[PDB]
Amino acid sequence: FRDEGRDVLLFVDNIYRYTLAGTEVSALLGRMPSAVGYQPTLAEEMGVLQERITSTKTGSITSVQAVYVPADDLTDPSPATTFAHLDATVVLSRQIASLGIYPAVDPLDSTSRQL
Amino acid sequence: TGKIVQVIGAVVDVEFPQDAVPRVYDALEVQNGNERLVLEVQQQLGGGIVRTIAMGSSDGLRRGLDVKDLEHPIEVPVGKATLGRIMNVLGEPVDMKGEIGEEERWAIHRAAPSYEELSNSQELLETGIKVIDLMAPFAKGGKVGLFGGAGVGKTVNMMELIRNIAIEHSGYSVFAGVGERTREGNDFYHEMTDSNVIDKVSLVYGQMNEPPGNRLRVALTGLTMAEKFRDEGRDVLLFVDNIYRYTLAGTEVSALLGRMPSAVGYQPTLAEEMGVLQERITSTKTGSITSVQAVYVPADDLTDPSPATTFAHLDATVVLSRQIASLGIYPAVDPLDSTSRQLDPLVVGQEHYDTARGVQSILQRYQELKDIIAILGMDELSEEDKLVVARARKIQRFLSQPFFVAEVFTGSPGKYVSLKDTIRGFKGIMEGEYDHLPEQAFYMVGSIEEAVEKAKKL
Amino acid sequence: MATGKIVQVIGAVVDVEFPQDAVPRVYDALEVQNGNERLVLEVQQQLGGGIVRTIAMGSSDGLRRGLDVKDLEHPIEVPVGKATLGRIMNVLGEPVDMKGEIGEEERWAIHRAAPSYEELSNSQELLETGIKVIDLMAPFAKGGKVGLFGGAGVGKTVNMMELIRNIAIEHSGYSVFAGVGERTREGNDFYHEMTDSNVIDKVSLVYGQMNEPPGNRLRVALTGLTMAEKFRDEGRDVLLFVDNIYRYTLAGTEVSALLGRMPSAVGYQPTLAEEMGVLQERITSTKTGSITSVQAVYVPADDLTDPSPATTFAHLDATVVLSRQIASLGIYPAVDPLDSTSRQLDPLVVGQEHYDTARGVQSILQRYQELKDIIAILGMDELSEEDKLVVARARKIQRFLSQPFFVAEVFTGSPGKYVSLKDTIRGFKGIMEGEYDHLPEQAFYMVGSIEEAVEKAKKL
Amino acid sequence: IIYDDLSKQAVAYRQISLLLRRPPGREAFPGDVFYLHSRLLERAARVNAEYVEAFTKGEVKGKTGSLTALPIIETQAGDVSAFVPT
Amino acid sequence: QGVVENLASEQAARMVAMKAATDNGGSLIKELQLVYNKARQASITQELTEIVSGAA
Numbered sequence A: 001f002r003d004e005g006r007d008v009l010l011f012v013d014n015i016y017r018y019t020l021a022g023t024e025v026s027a028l029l030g031r032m033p034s035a036v037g038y039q040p041t042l043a044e045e046m047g048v049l050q051e052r053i054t055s056t057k058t059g060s061i062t063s064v065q066a067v068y069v070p071a072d073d074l075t076d077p078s079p080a081t082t083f084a085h086l087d088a089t090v091v092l093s094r095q096i097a098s099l100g101i102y103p104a105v106d107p108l109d110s111t112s113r114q115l
Numbered sequence B: 001t002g003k004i005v006q007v008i009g010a011v012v013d014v015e016f017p018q019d020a021v022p023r024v025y026d027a028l029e030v031q032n033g034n035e036r037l038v039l040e041v042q043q044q045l046g047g048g049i050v051r052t053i054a055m056g057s058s059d060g061l062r063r064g065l066d067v068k069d070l071e072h073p074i075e076v077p078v079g080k081a082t083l084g085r086i087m088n089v090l091g092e093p094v095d096m097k098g099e100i101g102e103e104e105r106w107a108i109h110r111a112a113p114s115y116e117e118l119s120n121s122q123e124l125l126e127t128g129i130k131v132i133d134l135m136a137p138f139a140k141g142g143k144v145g146l147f148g149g150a151g152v153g154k155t156v157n158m159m160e161l162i163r164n165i166a167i168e169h170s171g172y173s174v175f176a177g178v179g180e181r182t183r184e185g186n187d188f189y190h191e192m193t194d195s196n197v198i199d200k201v202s203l204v205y206g207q208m209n210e211p212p213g214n215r216l217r218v219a220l221t222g223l224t225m226a227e228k229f230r231d232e233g234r235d236v237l238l239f240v241d242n243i244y245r246y247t248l249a250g251t252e253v254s255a256l257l258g259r260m261p262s263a264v265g266y267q268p269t270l271a272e273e274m275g276v277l278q279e280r281i282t283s284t285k286t287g288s289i290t291s292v293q294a295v296y297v298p299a300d301d302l303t304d305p306s307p308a309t310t311f312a313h314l315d316a317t318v319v320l321s322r323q324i325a326s327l328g329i330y331p332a333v334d335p336l337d338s339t340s341r342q343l344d345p346l347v348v349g350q351e352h353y354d355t356a357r358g359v360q361s362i363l364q365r366y367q368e369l370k371d372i373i374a375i376l377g378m379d380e381l382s383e384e385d386k387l388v389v390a391r392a393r394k395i396q397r398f399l400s401q402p403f404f405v406a407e408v409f410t411g412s413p414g415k416y417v418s419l420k421d422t423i424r425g426f427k428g429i430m431e432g433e434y435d436h437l438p439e440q441a442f443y444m445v446g447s448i449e450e451a452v453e454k455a456k457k458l
Numbered sequence C: 001m002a003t004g005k006i007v008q009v010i011g012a013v014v015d016v017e018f019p020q021d022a023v024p025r026v027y028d029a030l031e032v033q034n035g036n037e038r039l040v041l042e043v044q045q046q047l048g049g050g051i052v053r054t055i056a057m058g059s060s061d062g063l064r065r066g067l068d069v070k071d072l073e074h075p076i077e078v079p080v081g082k083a084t085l086g087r088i089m090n091v092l093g094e095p096v097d098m099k100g101e102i103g104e105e106e107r108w109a110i111h112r113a114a115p116s117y118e119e120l121s122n123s124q125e126l127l128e129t130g131i132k133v134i135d136l137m138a139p140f141a142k143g144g145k146v147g148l149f150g151g152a153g154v155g156k157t158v159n160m161m162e163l164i165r166n167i168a169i170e171h172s173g174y175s176v177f178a179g180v181g182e183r184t185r186e187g188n189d190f191y192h193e194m195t196d197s198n199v200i201d202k203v204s205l206v207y208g209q210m211n212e213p214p215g216n217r218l219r220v221a222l223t224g225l226t227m228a229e230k231f232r233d234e235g236r237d238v239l240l241f242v243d244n245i246y247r248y249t250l251a252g253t254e255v256s257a258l259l260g261r262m263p264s265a266v267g268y269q270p271t272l273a274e275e276m277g278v279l280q281e282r283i284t285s286t287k288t289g290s291i292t293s294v295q296a297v298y299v300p301a302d303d304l305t306d307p308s309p310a311t312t313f314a315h316l317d318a319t320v321v322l323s324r325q326i327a328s329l330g331i332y333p334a335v336d337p338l339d340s341t342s343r344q345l346d347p348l349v350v351g352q353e354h355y356d357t358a359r360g361v362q363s364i365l366q367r368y369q370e371l372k373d374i375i376a377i378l379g380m381d382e383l384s385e386e387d388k389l390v391v392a393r394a395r396k397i398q399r400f401l402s403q404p405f406f407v408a409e410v411f412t413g414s415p416g417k418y419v420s421l422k423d424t425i426r427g428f429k430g431i432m433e434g435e436y437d438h439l440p441e442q443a444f445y446m447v448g449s450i451e452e453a454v455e456k457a458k459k460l
Numbered sequence D: 001i002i003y004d005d006l007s008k009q010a011v012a013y014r015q016i017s018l019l020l021r022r023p024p025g026r027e028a029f030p031g032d033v034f035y036l037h038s039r040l041l042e043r044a045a046r047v048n049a050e051y052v053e054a055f056t057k058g059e060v061k062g063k064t065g066s067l068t069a070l071p072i073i074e075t076q077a078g079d080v081s082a083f084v085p086t
Numbered sequence E: 001q002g003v004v005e006n007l008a009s010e011q012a013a014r015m016v017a018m019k020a021a022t023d024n025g026g027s028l029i030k031e032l033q034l035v036y037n038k039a040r041q042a043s044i045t046q047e048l049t050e051i052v053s054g055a056a
């Protein structure tokens, strides 16, 4: 749709399980394991996916992506690597939600490069 | 008819002709100089190779020694003749008395009793120790486990249980010494013989100096004997000195058997090794086994996979803690983790249940106040939080008790507290009717009477 | 004639195939021509088939499979003795300064055996550094190990230069400096600061710069150690400075990891304690001479339980702590008297007078710290006469811990002073017991002996 | 359906894997332990009446079927961070 | 007069109480740091055991 010259929305319901399917595959491909049990190629695989999702001089893709952060850690390699690629970041927090407030967005960790 | 072809630590590989290869768990035999050595088959490898664990010292083995194939498992003496005597893992007499005049021998590898054969009982079996009975009542024919780190009292508690349970038990008993101190067993044996109760106890010893195979298979042997006395229709008491060593022996052997490590360096088959032993130490419609198992926990870590999987196999679990022992409070049971399947209103009555839950509620609230007490001290508590702290401290002290087996340490006379006395005492303390005594009055006193009396002595 | 051939090149690890009857021994040194430069390889493991696995003491780039490897029948050998004083060398004992070829009376192998039992000194002598804080509060055993727990910016290097100077002048010893894992910038200006202070002629320098491969950095420590062993065998008492022992531990970890051995503890090499013991047990007092060592220590994550500190602390005898706060007071050297300690402070080895004096000044300074908190919250009005006496004597003691170095004349302009142990003991004895209460505290500051304190006071 | 201690299933699949010498993963669990529980729990569904008519070959019309799952998991001192709980 | 003296007594009592609280807080820091460092070392050991035992 982009190369036809259109402006399109791409909604991806969770990017984490792309990396996680990659991990399950990687174990049996004979790749030597990496930190936190992840594949060696984690950043490469993520980059090969995210770089295609852009707006060019011929057309525009607008992208909204959910990412699962395990255990709310926000610090293990898969959430860490995915932060680099995004223009707008909204980090929902279990703590705010638990107190009963929706949306659970943390204003101290959420921002956009349009601000 | 077979030849030794590799020797790795306690593990020995033997080659046999293709038509003569042993079955799994068959017993082989080797001349090791002037000694006789028994090997137990663990695995069949390709090409007539068979891999075994030495039930004895591996030192002095060459390659090329001839191995003899005994075509049966390890089989042990069994029945009324095994009573009052001490035996090897291989069923050999280790006391200096003569031969065991056994009429029957059983193989130590057996199938567990069927689900159709099992039985259930609600009968409370009173134990003298005050804390165990109130917090975690134990019924006859069930399993009890004492969890604790190094040097927290899980052997001594079992000796008090042996004393108190033997008061109201008439039948035979079996004791399995698995990977523990030889001195504890020697002292036990002479206590039994000097009190003439030895005529009713059968003992198997596999203590911690013996090579891994002995310590691994000694537990199974003891179960074989306990199962004989069950299957005669009797009721039997089975004491296991340390079940942790049994899993650890498997760990020590596991990597040499050519198996990838699991979790924190453990053998991948840990859960099945524990289950296959635990499921045959059980009651049946013909007879019942009552068992107490000491469960060592490494590095005081109650989340370690071996203790963790042991928890699921027990009816009453008493959890000892070093923090309480360091405060002088013995027996050092943690009331906020010790539990029993029998603590039900239907089983023990509404008073027995309400008192225990009040004790737990009060203690649990004591825990939550400790952080503010730590930072700011007690004067910033609410005026009834102070009262909760006072009653919780009194309760903590009254859980302590003098033991008849601790006279060698405390010097104080021992105490036995019946059920219709301890729940009365704790109910009164909870309701505040004895709140006026000082904290020290409750330390190491048997009953509420002895506490008020001790308060008269300040 | 060369007789081995390279089989593999994987990073710093290089494998070599020799004839079956000639396989070089462990820690033997080998040479190859890597282009138009020679490259030295150190043998680590003798694998099957006649293949030895080595580590390149230099960049392993440009090596081809099938090069010819020449078998030196000895370990790496370095020059030793007086000809090395004032020079700068790399791992291999080659000059990295531009002053040219070294005299090379003798060349010695870095891999050497340790002193044996019947060779150890049957006595437990002390070393008189001449610095008041150190000789009073943290005395050095002759042949002991000392740990310097301070970050850069507080006077580490000036302390080191003062010890070099005093051991060269007031004794007849030389020093060896081993710059393990040192930034090149520092090496350059440490060299400048020693040459512009006339101590350079009395110290030998070996630098392992961080841009060097892990094999280089690890063996740099051993090179300095063997040069110190030569000065010991000549009958002297010698000082060996290690610029960071933690870097030696980490170089060992990196090499062990490259060779593929299974890790231990918190990811360290399995041979950690052995490698530390191999280094530290050579530094001892023998029946001919001694090597005393002062070693800078870095504690990972500020964690004193980590295996590197836990292994290093097994070997240290004394412990010198440098304080940012003390330095801010204008007090130099910035040693902290309450955290610096030595296991030589016992009456059984140091005597009852010295022990009771050190214990006394420690007690006074500690009580002063508590009283200074009381003053901070409630002013001086709370103090009794006894408290005011304690505070006054504590201030005089604290001033008296300062000293002018022969190296510090550039800044203070005051002549440097070397203070004998007896003078230090007498000074703190007197100040503790109420003598010299009649002259002001600034008479004690930066002066020297106590006699010099009173003679400063007379016109202050 | 009440699956009881699905964790005591995961230990079992791990035992099979490590005895079969497959490459181990985090906490030594097999990599494909997510796929085990994922393809077990996704069977719990509510199915529309057209699926029920197509399956029963028209014998049952106009009724939806359902399977409700209640898995049980054990935590080591409550740490949700563990591999199987997560 | 009694009121003013009780106010001064309040200030002194709060002073000593806050002294005790500060010391107890520091003494709790020194225990939490041992717990933290032991957990740090254990986590590194376990992860590296999984990685090395994971290869081949």
Ligand SMILES: Nc1ncnc2c1ncn2[C@@H]1O[C@H](COP(=O)(O)OP(=O)(O)OP(=O)(O)O)[C@@H](O)[C@H]1O
Pocket: B148, B149, B150, B151, B152, B153, B154, B155, B156, B157, B296, B330, B331, B401, B403, B406, B409, B410
């Ligand atoms: N009731 C008690 N009163 C006082 N001390 C006790 C009591 N129970 C146990 N202890 C103390 O515990 C010590 C060790 O007892 P025990 O052998 O039962 O411990 P353990 O945890 O099973 O140790 P291990 O695994 O080393 O055998 C005793 O010597 C004694 O000091």
Ligand SMILES: Nc1ncnc2c1ncn2[C@@H]1O[C@H](COP(=O)(O)OP(=O)(O)O)[C@@H](O)[C@H]1O
Pocket: C151, C152, C153, C154, C155, C156, C157, C158, C332, C333, C405, C408, C411, C412
């Ligand atoms: N004895 C001393 N006399 C004067 N200044 C000193 C002395 N010791 C340290 N300093 C000051 O401390 C600062 C850093 O000293 P430096 O020798 O560079 O410390 P380090 O060796 O730790 O890097 C300099 O400003 C230096 O003047």
Ligand SMILES: [Mg+2]
Pocket: B154, B155, B156, B184
């Ligand atoms: Mg014991």
